[PDB]
Design a binder for this molecule. Sequence first.
Ligand SMILES: *Cc1ccc(S(=O)(=O)N2CCC(OC)CC2)cc1
Ligand SMILES: *Cc1ccc(S(=O)(=O)N2CCC(OC)CC2)cc1
Ligand SMILES: [Ca+2]
Ligand SMILES: [Ca+2]
Lengths: 228, 228, 9, 9
Amino acid sequence: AMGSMERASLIQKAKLAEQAERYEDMAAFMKGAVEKGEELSCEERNLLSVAYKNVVGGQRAAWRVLSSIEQKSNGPEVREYREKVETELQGVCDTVLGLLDSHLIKEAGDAESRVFYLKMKGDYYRYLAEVATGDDKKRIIDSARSAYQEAMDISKKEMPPTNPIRLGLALNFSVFHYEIANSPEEAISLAKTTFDEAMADLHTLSEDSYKDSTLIMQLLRDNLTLWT
Amino acid sequence: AMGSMERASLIQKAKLAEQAERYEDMAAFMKGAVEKGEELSCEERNLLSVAYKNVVGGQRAAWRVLSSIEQKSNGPEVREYREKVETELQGVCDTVLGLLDSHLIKEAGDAESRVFYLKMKGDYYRYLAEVATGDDKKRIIDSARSAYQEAMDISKKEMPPTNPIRLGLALNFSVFHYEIANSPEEAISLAKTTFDEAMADLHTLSEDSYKDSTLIMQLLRDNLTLWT
Amino acid sequence: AGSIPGRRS
Amino acid sequence: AGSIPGRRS
Ligand SMILES: *Cc1ccc(S(=O)(=O)N2CCC(OC)CC2)cc1
Ligand SMILES: *Cc1ccc(S(=O)(=O)N2CCC(OC)CC2)cc1
Ligand SMILES: [Ca+2]
Ligand SMILES: [Ca+2]
């Protein structure tokens, strides 16, 4: 749909859409930019991720409201509307996963880009898992786990323990273990080890990098406080 | 688009959409309900109004962000994107105005319903006026003024001075005078007279009606404080 | 200047 | 449990 707009114009409009809090537009501009076929810079990857996290975040919040109403009620309206929101959410997750598969991941050779995209892949399978039931749920859960694990393996070999993408990946994989995989001990162990190894590497950082790393470390600590 | 869904199901889903903060869905359900052709109850009119006020409120906020960026900058991208948001906003206002004209207003015989719909008509022409330029602007401004004035005339004949719709109509018409019609003295005089006449009628109200009326009176006072 | 917020039923 | 908010560039 964005085929006639220049790549640079799509990027500029995605930044404007963010300022205007128009996240659906932002995601559509960034989808258009990905479909130009060129790799994304660090800032462009962040725009893609921010756009879709906002879109799916609002869908997830709505799905949770409707699922709670439906569970309390247990006419067809609540289930029908929860199903409509669920299908829309699944469609957005499938769209992001399709961008990652065609062809962002395969072209990502540097650790920073490949880890970022595999973390995204884990996240969007995790959002699919949140609404999945039964056996479909098992394969979706394993797809999230596999993406996160590959990202973890690369991150531990190629990035310092304070790298913000490495830290956010570990945070989100710990949430996966706690909330999706029914592995709270694995969640706690990953969050603790990640926090401690980052603490021991803070001395190497500038003041600005210190601020970025400690912000995510606080999120790990916030979860550990809630889980223990 | 909602032709195959029962009226009562559209109403139920509009309430669910409000709870889920899915205001575009809410507006689409309420448009479907209006298009069933039956008059709306008090609660249904409020659902219609809440849905569209939220949709157009987000569009207006985005348009203001983009218009400010465009004015500071004075490539084509900011203007193009402001124009896109503007066209979408105009389309929503035209949709609401079309529901009011086909056929909510003509079927509204009681003062409460007719004033409510004419207030809506003034509001959506006011939102069109906010983005209009030049001579188109003049006719749009007069359409807002005419709708508000008819609503005012009915409200003063048929409703007590504390009626919340009468109060909200006067509030919004005062904003029209201040922000659109370049008539700040008319805005201040209308807000003051409305406040004072409501104050003198509070003694007639129950505790719950008192709470409803005084809440809007505080909005009138807040504007008077800003304008004087 | 504030109009009716009008965004909650 | 909080994941990365990730909603502001
Ligand atoms: C998944 C994730 C991890 C960390 C962030 S961030 O806000 O701290 N930040 C890290 C540095 C930059 O590299 C991509 C930009 C994002 C965001 C998301
Ligand atoms: C335009 C407008 C005026 C007042 C309100 S309200 O929130 O005070 N309320 C008044 C009583 C009911 O009648 C419609 C429901 C709305 C809202 C909008
Ligand atoms: Ca080009
Ligand atoms: Ca019917």
